[PDB]
Amino acid sequence: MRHLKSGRKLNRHSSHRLALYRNQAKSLLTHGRITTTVPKAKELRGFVDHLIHLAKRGDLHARRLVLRDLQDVKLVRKLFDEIAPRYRDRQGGYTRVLKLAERRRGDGAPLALVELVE
Amino acid sequence: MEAKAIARYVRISPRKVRLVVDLIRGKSLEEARNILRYTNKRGAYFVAKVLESAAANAVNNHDMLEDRLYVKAAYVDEGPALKRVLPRARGRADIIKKRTSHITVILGEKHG
Amino acid sequence: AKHPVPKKKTSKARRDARRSHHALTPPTLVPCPECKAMKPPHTVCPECGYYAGRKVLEV
Amino acid sequence: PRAKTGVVRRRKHKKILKLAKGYWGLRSKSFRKARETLFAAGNYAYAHRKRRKRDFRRLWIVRINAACRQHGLNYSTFIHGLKKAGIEVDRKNLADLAVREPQVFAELVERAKAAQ
Amino acid sequence: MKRTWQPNRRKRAKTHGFRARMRTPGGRKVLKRRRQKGRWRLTPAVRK
RNA sequence: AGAUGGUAAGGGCCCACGGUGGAUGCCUCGGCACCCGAGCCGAUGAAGGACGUGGCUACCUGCGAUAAGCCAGGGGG
RNA sequence: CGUGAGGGAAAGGUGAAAAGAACCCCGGGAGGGGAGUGAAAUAGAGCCUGAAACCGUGGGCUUACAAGCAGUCACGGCCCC
RNA sequence: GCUGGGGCUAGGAGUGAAAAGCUAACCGAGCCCGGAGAUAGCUGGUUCUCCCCGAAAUGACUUUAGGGUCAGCCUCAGGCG
RNA sequence: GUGGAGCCUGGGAGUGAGGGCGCGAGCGAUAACGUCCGCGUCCGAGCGCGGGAACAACCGAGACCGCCAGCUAAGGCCCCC
RNA sequence: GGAUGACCCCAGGCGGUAGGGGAGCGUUCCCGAUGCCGAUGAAGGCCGACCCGCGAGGGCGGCUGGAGGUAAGGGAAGUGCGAAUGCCGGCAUGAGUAACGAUAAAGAGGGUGAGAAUCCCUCUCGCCGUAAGCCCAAGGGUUCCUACGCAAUGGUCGUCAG
Ligand SMILES: [Mg+2]
Ligand SMILES: [Mg+2]
Ligand SMILES: [Mg+2]
Ligand SMILES: [Mg+2]
Ligand SMILES: [Mg+2]
Ligand SMILES: [Mg+2]
Ligand SMILES: [Mg+2]
Ligand SMILES: [Mg+2]
Ligand SMILES: [Mg+2]
Ligand SMILES: [Mg+2]
Ligand SMILES: [Mg+2]
Ligand SMILES: [Mg+2]
Ligand SMILES: [Mg+2]
Ligand SMILES: [Mg+2]
Ligand SMILES: [Mg+2]
Ligand SMILES: [Mg+2]
Ligand SMILES: [Mg+2]
Ligand SMILES: [Mg+2]
Ligand SMILES: [Mg+2]
Ligand SMILES: [Mg+2]
Ligand SMILES: [Mg+2]
Ligand SMILES: [Mg+2]
Ligand SMILES: [Mg+2]
Ligand SMILES: [Mg+2]
Ligand SMILES: [Mg+2]
Ligand SMILES: [Mg+2]
Ligand SMILES: [Mg+2]
Ligand SMILES: [Mg+2]
Ligand SMILES: [Mg+2]
Ligand SMILES: [Mg+2]
Ligand SMILES: [Mg+2]
Ligand SMILES: [Mg+2]
Ligand SMILES: [Mg+2]
Ligand SMILES: [Mg+2]
Ligand SMILES: [Mg+2]
Ligand SMILES: [Mg+2]
Ligand SMILES: [Mg+2]
Ligand SMILES: [Mg+2]
Ligand SMILES: [Mg+2]
Ligand SMILES: [Mg+2]
Ligand SMILES: [Mg+2]
Ligand SMILES: [Mg+2]
Ligand SMILES: [Mg+2]
Ligand SMILES: [Mg+2]
Ligand SMILES: [Mg+2]
Ligand SMILES: [Mg+2]
Ligand SMILES: [Mg+2]
Ligand SMILES: [Mg+2]
Ligand SMILES: [Mg+2]
Ligand SMILES: [Mg+2]
Ligand SMILES: [Mg+2]
Ligand SMILES: [Mg+2]
Ligand SMILES: [Mg+2]
Ligand SMILES: [Mg+2]
Ligand SMILES: [Mg+2]
Ligand SMILES: [Mg+2]
Ligand SMILES: [Mg+2]
Ligand SMILES: [Mg+2]
Ligand SMILES: [Mg+2]
Ligand SMILES: [Mg+2]
Ligand SMILES: [Mg+2]
Ligand SMILES: [Mg+2]
Ligand SMILES: [Mg+2]
Ligand SMILES: [Mg+2]
Ligand SMILES: [Mg+2]
Ligand SMILES: [Mg+2]
Ligand SMILES: [Mg+2]
Ligand SMILES: [Mg+2]
Ligand SMILES: [Mg+2]
Ligand SMILES: [Mg+2]
Ligand SMILES: [Mg+2]
Ligand SMILES: [Mg+2]
Ligand SMILES: [Mg+2]
Ligand SMILES: [Mg+2]
Ligand SMILES: [Mg+2]
Ligand SMILES: [Mg+2]
Ligand SMILES: [Mg+2]
Ligand SMILES: [Mg+2]
Ligand SMILES: [Mg+2]
Ligand SMILES: [Mg+2]
Ligand SMILES: [Mg+2]
Ligand SMILES: [Mg+2]
Ligand SMILES: [Mg+2]
Ligand SMILES: [Mg+2]
Ligand SMILES: [Mg+2]
Ligand SMILES: [Mg+2]
Ligand SMILES: [Mg+2]
Ligand SMILES: [Mg+2]
Ligand SMILES: [Mg+2]
Ligand SMILES: [Mg+2]
Ligand SMILES: [Mg+2]
Ligand SMILES: [Mg+2]
Ligand SMILES: [Mg+2]
Ligand SMILES: [Mg+2]
Ligand SMILES: [Mg+2]
Ligand SMILES: [Mg+2]
Ligand SMILES: [Mg+2]
Ligand SMILES: [Mg+2]
Ligand SMILES: [Mg+2]
Ligand SMILES: [Mg+2]
Ligand SMILES: [Mg+2]
Ligand SMILES: [Mg+2]
Ligand SMILES: [Mg+2]
Ligand SMILES: [Mg+2]
Ligand SMILES: [Mg+2]
Ligand SMILES: [Mg+2]
Ligand SMILES: [Mg+2]
Ligand SMILES: [Mg+2]
Ligand SMILES: [Mg+2]
Ligand SMILES: [Mg+2]
Ligand SMILES: [Mg+2]
Ligand SMILES: [Mg+2]
Ligand SMILES: [Mg+2]
Ligand SMILES: [Mg+2]
Ligand SMILES: [Mg+2]
Ligand SMILES: [Mg+2]
Ligand SMILES: [Mg+2]
Ligand SMILES: [Mg+2]
Ligand SMILES: [Mg+2]
Ligand SMILES: [Mg+2]
Ligand SMILES: [Mg+2]
Ligand SMILES: [Mg+2]
Ligand SMILES: [Mg+2]
Ligand SMILES: [Mg+2]
Ligand SMILES: [Mg+2]
Ligand SMILES: [Mg+2]
Ligand SMILES: [Mg+2]
Ligand SMILES: [Mg+2]
Ligand SMILES: [Mg+2]
Ligand SMILES: [Mg+2]
Ligand SMILES: [Mg+2]
Ligand SMILES: [Mg+2]
Ligand SMILES: [Mg+2]
Ligand SMILES: [Mg+2]
Ligand SMILES: [Mg+2]
Ligand SMILES: [Mg+2]
Ligand SMILES: [Mg+2]
Ligand SMILES: [Mg+2]
Ligand SMILES: [Mg+2]
Ligand SMILES: [Mg+2]
Ligand SMILES: [Mg+2]
Ligand SMILES: [Mg+2]
Ligand SMILES: [Mg+2]
Ligand SMILES: [Mg+2]
Ligand SMILES: [Mg+2]
Ligand SMILES: [Mg+2]
Ligand SMILES: [Mg+2]
Ligand SMILES: [Mg+2]
Ligand SMILES: [Mg+2]
Ligand SMILES: [Mg+2]
Ligand SMILES: [Mg+2]
Ligand SMILES: [Mg+2]
Ligand SMILES: [Mg+2]
Ligand SMILES: [Mg+2]
Ligand SMILES: [Mg+2]
Ligand SMILES: [Mg+2]
Ligand SMILES: [Mg+2]
Ligand SMILES: [Mg+2]
Ligand SMILES: [Mg+2]
Ligand SMILES: [Mg+2]
Ligand SMILES: [Mg+2]
Ligand SMILES: [Mg+2]
Ligand SMILES: [Mg+2]
Ligand SMILES: [Mg+2]
Ligand SMILES: [Mg+2]
Ligand SMILES: [Mg+2]
Ligand SMILES: [Mg+2]
Ligand SMILES: [Mg+2]
Ligand SMILES: [Mg+2]
Ligand SMILES: [Mg+2]
Ligand SMILES: [Mg+2]
Ligand SMILES: [Mg+2]
Ligand SMILES: [Mg+2]
Ligand SMILES: [Mg+2]
Ligand SMILES: [Mg+2]
Ligand SMILES: [Mg+2]
Ligand SMILES: [Mg+2]
Ligand SMILES: [Mg+2]
Ligand SMILES: [Mg+2]
Ligand SMILES: [Mg+2]
Ligand SMILES: [Mg+2]
Ligand SMILES: [Mg+2]
Ligand SMILES: [Mg+2]
Ligand SMILES: [Mg+2]
Ligand SMILES: [Mg+2]
Ligand SMILES: [Mg+2]
Ligand SMILES: [Mg+2]
Ligand SMILES: [Mg+2]
Ligand SMILES: [Mg+2]
Ligand SMILES: [Mg+2]
Ligand SMILES: [Mg+2]
Ligand SMILES: [Mg+2]
Ligand SMILES: [Mg+2]
Ligand SMILES: [Mg+2]
Ligand SMILES: [Mg+2]
Ligand SMILES: [Mg+2]
Ligand SMILES: [Mg+2]
Ligand SMILES: [Mg+2]
Ligand SMILES: [Zn+2]
């Protein structure tokens, strides 16, 4: 069973799943908007929102924390200096998911876009 | 007056395409178009082409009006099968039948 | 195991009876309030790019 | 010279398959199964031609019996009276009378009671 | 595992070759039989 | 209280028309039998081959660096 | 196919004549719809004839309280002539 | 000790630290072709229709016993009556 | 006693695993859907028909074809029937 | 009965496996045939609720087909299939089922294109590293490089490719 269990598995072992989220985070923070499968998208929100919320803190601790997942100093500089500030007065919800209308041809996978909020 | 199009020797298995065809038989050209566009099946691609070709035939050759066309008749026939070898364990060789479809769409005019 | 096997050829009636549940359900579609085109609901319209009133996507 | 099968066998199968129209599944579509079904069918027809004669006589008797007990006697007593009376109207016509011409049947009953 | 066919150009020519067949009465009868049958190759083709 | 209908997810029988498949009839560039004719080739390098050979040439046929051919006689038109 | 000696298939037919379908239309193509050829094109090259198993579309009758080698005999209902 | 390359030994024969092991994925006697359509008192199979008749599963003998020869029982033709 | 009786001469067979039942015995255990003989019977080949709930050989009865006619056999006649 | 096989009348027989006998049907071929049927449509095919025959069958009619067929009477045989775990071929059932070949692993962005999870480029991630890198020899034989292609081969896709 699965009673009151939180978190998708996405058919990956523990370290692959982590990487998946970390890589999607790098891509989202880099381009502001990416397209994925709906399940990957819905799961990315929390992972990235937390990273953004820490950038909103600003301190050295937060920077080194975010650096654990994002791993890229320049990308984190962008996070703290350009991304984080526009969410100063926003209380969570820094990302949105909207579903596309067309499925992948090769496997019928339903797609969705994930973007940072205005 | 009717207009028809046939796609012969389409490399898809009849039992599969017919599922898609069944979705559009009897429907307006417009609804049939909308259905096929969001039918998550390989067959939707093929059935759509035959539909559109038949619509073209109706307008361009048979003096029928696009805004009145409906799918009067549609069916799939079995074409010749492509026989291929599938190697199995213990030196045994099976035969895969990569099957083939003859897709037919026949359009009529919905008067009134 | 000892290799189970069909004892009798399935009749045309019985094979087709099995498939009484095999018919496809047509796609559920709704008009897009902006361009009136037909598209699945709760998806961004692939024709004009609008959803929830605003332009979201370049078509 | 050589006398290959040619046309002959197809025609023979065609004869049988035609006789087997209406049968279920392969019994109407497969020669072998059609032929087997037809064997049974032929024996049934012969046997049931024989039983049809039984079937109806049995029905007539049931009906005559109902008509008799309306007049206060049973079939056995009725037929014996008719025998003593010498009325040789068979059970096919007796049943018809019982339904269509009750006055005539009522009369015949009286004759049967009297012959006793 | 190691299977039975282990190609060797030298071995092939020295065993089934034309010169090998002509050396032996039985091998000459092979060539006779194949020619009479009209074989396109009297002897296993091989590259040297 | 009583009674009796239309339902077809699908199935069955029949009819029509198709698809598949290639039987049947017709056909014959081939074969089979008998009869007759005819009957050896090779160091003057056979039988049988290899590789080549065409303005463009995969294969077959023909031919052999004179290479789908060279010379002469005969036939034929 | 076999190291080899050796084993050893399948596979014929448009039409009288290519007159083998210019050109246009849908399609990436394949395929088809018109146009055209022909006595004939379900003779269109996957080509004479085109049976059967097998698959499908349309129509008639029928079927969701019923017990079976599937028929047969009887009667009734519906459809057709 | 393992291993590459080059060699030699074979079918009642080879080779075998011996398992009747191995000798080209089945070896108490390899494979191919031939004798060859071996032989099989055994198993299977044996194709249109109608008409008349209609058995036996016993006896004797049999390296015979689930096979046969003779008799018995069936059928046809002619004759006797 | 004129019968698909009989005898004679020829042609062609098939059969040479029988089985149940009744009666008479042997064997067995006054066992076996047992075994082995004898007389008969039926099934075999009448798994065609009626009866015995169903059921080759128990009872009734030897099915050329047709009938929506009649009489019976065994067995039945309260309802299924 | 009449004169012999004409047909009628009367009577009786007519279950049947092994098997004996009789009479017929149809197939290929020959004489009949230098004939006759035949494009006003041969053979073959598909229908028929019609006619003849106990039956095997034979007619006739409509559709198909488009060049052959073949009588009365005889002759000769490669002469009739439902079974042989028969032979060859075609097509079904199981079934939209098992499976898609190492659990080293993927994600996004940008190109191309009718079409892209699968081709090209970039960034991120993972795997091998006495190898899963590199160089020879066997064997294989153009698979090498480039252009143009995607019907089939590729266990999906394909614009990519041995
Ligand atoms: Mg669990
Ligand atoms: Mg929860
Ligand atoms: Mg969960
Ligand atoms: Mg987690
Ligand atoms: Mg995934
Ligand atoms: Mg999984
Ligand atoms: Mg780990
Ligand atoms: Mg970690
Ligand atoms: Mg962008
Ligand atoms: Mg990290
Ligand atoms: Mg979606
Ligand atoms: Mg879609
Ligand atoms: Mg795909
Ligand atoms: Mg969707
Ligand atoms: Mg489909
Ligand atoms: Mg269907
Ligand atoms: Mg769908
Ligand atoms: Mg149009
Ligand atoms: Mg496998
Ligand atoms: Mg293998
Ligand atoms: Mg199969
Ligand atoms: Mg298959
Ligand atoms: Mg197919
Ligand atoms: Mg196990
Ligand atoms: Mg089955
Ligand atoms: Mg079955
Ligand atoms: Mg079946
Ligand atoms: Mg089944
Ligand atoms: Mg069906
Ligand atoms: Mg909206
Ligand atoms: Mg034959
Ligand atoms: Mg039938
Ligand atoms: Mg019926
Ligand atoms: Mg019968
Ligand atoms: Mg009768
Ligand atoms: Mg009667
Ligand atoms: Mg009676
Ligand atoms: Mg009486
Ligand atoms: Mg009476
Ligand atoms: Mg009345
Ligand atoms: Mg090992
Ligand atoms: Mg090793
Ligand atoms: Mg090999
Ligand atoms: Mg091999
Ligand atoms: Mg080696
Ligand atoms: Mg070498
Ligand atoms: Mg060597
Ligand atoms: Mg040599
Ligand atoms: Mg010599
Ligand atoms: Mg030799
Ligand atoms: Mg060869
Ligand atoms: Mg050659
Ligand atoms: Mg050789
Ligand atoms: Mg109702
Ligand atoms: Mg229905
Ligand atoms: Mg339905
Ligand atoms: Mg057809
Ligand atoms: Mg064909
Ligand atoms: Mg002929
Ligand atoms: Mg000749
Ligand atoms: Mg001489
Ligand atoms: Mg030469
Ligand atoms: Mg040449
Ligand atoms: Mg000259
Ligand atoms: Mg000259
Ligand atoms: Mg000259
Ligand atoms: Mg090989
Ligand atoms: Mg080879
Ligand atoms: Mg052909
Ligand atoms: Mg021609
Ligand atoms: Mg020609
Ligand atoms: Mg185009
Ligand atoms: Mg165009
Ligand atoms: Mg393309
Ligand atoms: Mg075209
Ligand atoms: Mg066309
Ligand atoms: Mg014309
Ligand atoms: Mg014309
Ligand atoms: Mg004409
Ligand atoms: Mg056309
Ligand atoms: Mg046609
Ligand atoms: Mg036609
Ligand atoms: Mg034609
Ligand atoms: Mg012709
Ligand atoms: Mg045709
Ligand atoms: Mg065809
Ligand atoms: Mg057909
Ligand atoms: Mg139907
Ligand atoms: Mg109830
Ligand atoms: Mg009911
Ligand atoms: Mg029922
Ligand atoms: Mg039953
Ligand atoms: Mg009934
Ligand atoms: Mg009745
Ligand atoms: Mg050494
Ligand atoms: Mg060595
Ligand atoms: Mg060596
Ligand atoms: Mg030996
Ligand atoms: Mg030997
Ligand atoms: Mg020895
Ligand atoms: Mg070998
Ligand atoms: Mg071995
Ligand atoms: Mg031996
Ligand atoms: Mg061996
Ligand atoms: Mg030999
Ligand atoms: Mg001999
Ligand atoms: Mg012997
Ligand atoms: Mg008798
Ligand atoms: Mg005896
Ligand atoms: Mg005895
Ligand atoms: Mg002795
Ligand atoms: Mg014995
Ligand atoms: Mg014996
Ligand atoms: Mg005898
Ligand atoms: Mg006599
Ligand atoms: Mg006498
Ligand atoms: Mg007498
Ligand atoms: Mg007698
Ligand atoms: Mg007698
Ligand atoms: Mg005698
Ligand atoms: Mg005798
Ligand atoms: Mg005889
Ligand atoms: Mg015997
Ligand atoms: Mg004996
Ligand atoms: Mg005995
Ligand atoms: Mg005995
Ligand atoms: Mg005895
Ligand atoms: Mg006896
Ligand atoms: Mg008994
Ligand atoms: Mg007693
Ligand atoms: Mg006693
Ligand atoms: Mg006893
Ligand atoms: Mg006893
Ligand atoms: Mg007895
Ligand atoms: Mg017997
Ligand atoms: Mg009995
Ligand atoms: Mg008897
Ligand atoms: Mg029984
Ligand atoms: Mg009984
Ligand atoms: Mg009984
Ligand atoms: Mg009575
Ligand atoms: Mg009584
Ligand atoms: Mg009583
Ligand atoms: Mg009663
Ligand atoms: Mg009589
Ligand atoms: Mg008689
Ligand atoms: Mg009798
Ligand atoms: Mg008889
Ligand atoms: Mg015949
Ligand atoms: Mg003559
Ligand atoms: Mg002549
Ligand atoms: Mg004429
Ligand atoms: Mg005509
Ligand atoms: Mg003929
Ligand atoms: Mg004929
Ligand atoms: Mg008839
Ligand atoms: Mg007829
Ligand atoms: Mg006719
Ligand atoms: Mg005709
Ligand atoms: Mg015509
Ligand atoms: Mg001619
Ligand atoms: Mg003969
Ligand atoms: Mg024969
Ligand atoms: Mg048979
Ligand atoms: Mg089997
Ligand atoms: Mg079996
Ligand atoms: Mg066999
Ligand atoms: Mg067979
Ligand atoms: Mg087969
Ligand atoms: Mg499923
Ligand atoms: Mg299953
Ligand atoms: Mg499953
Ligand atoms: Mg699966
Ligand atoms: Mg794989
Ligand atoms: Mg696999
Ligand atoms: Mg895998
Ligand atoms: Mg995996
Ligand atoms: Mg892209
Ligand atoms: Mg561009
Ligand atoms: Mg583009
Ligand atoms: Mg792709
Ligand atoms: Mg693609
Ligand atoms: Mg991509
Ligand atoms: Mg992959
Ligand atoms: Mg490692
Ligand atoms: Mg290292
Ligand atoms: Mg290591
Ligand atoms: Mg080399
Ligand atoms: Mg190779
Ligand atoms: Mg270049
Ligand atoms: Mg491809
Ligand atoms: Mg492709
Ligand atoms: Mg393609
Ligand atoms: Mg191409
Ligand atoms: Mg593919
Ligand atoms: Mg593969
Ligand atoms: Mg390229
Ligand atoms: Mg390459
Ligand atoms: Zn829209």
Where in the sequence is the domain holding B77, given as residue range(s)?
A: 2-110
E48/G81 CA-to-C1' distance in Å: 86
Q: What is the CATH number of the domain that holds B8?
A: 3.90.470.10
Tell me, in angstroms, the distance from the centre of ligand 91 to residue A62's CA: 78
Q: What is the resolution of this structure in A?
A: 2.9
* Helix, strand, coil percentages, rounded to 5, for chain A: 55, 15, 30
- Domain A14-118: state its class: alpha beta
User: What residues does each domain of chain A span?
Assistant: 14-118
Give the number of domains in chain B: 1
Strand G contacted by E11 CB (< 7 A): no
Q: Which of B14, B82, B80, B71 is nearest to B43 (CA)?
A: B14
Strand I contacted by D47 CB (< 7 A): yes
Q: Do C39 and A101 touch (CB under 8 A)?
A: yes
Amino acid at B63: D
Closest residue in C to A99 (Cα–Cα): C43
* Shortest-distance ligand to the CA of residue B77: 23
Strand J contacted by A75 CB (< 7 A): no
Elucidation method: X-ray
Q: CA D105, CA D107: separation in Å to the nearest integer?
A: 5
Strand I contacted by D54 CB (< 7 A): no
Sequence-ordered list of residues with C-beta below 8 angstroms from that of A33, at least 6 positions apart, any chain? A113, A114, A115, A116
Tell me, in angstroms, the distance from the centre of ligand 76 to residue B51's CA: 16
Q: CA A97, CA A107: separation in Å to the nearest integer?
A: 21
Token readout for C10 is 């399935």
Q: Exposed (0-12), middle (13-18) or buried (19+): which is B27, by Cβ within 10 Å?
A: middle
Contact A38, A112 (CB under 8 A): yes
A-chain residues near C56 (CB < 8 A):
98, 113
Please state whether at least 3 CB pairs lie below 8 Å between chains A and C: yes
Q: CA A95, CA A42: separation in Å to the nearest integer?
A: 10
A-chain residues near B36 (CB < 8 A):
none
Whole-Å CA distances, C42 to A97, A99, A100, C34, D69? 11, 7, 9, 14, 80
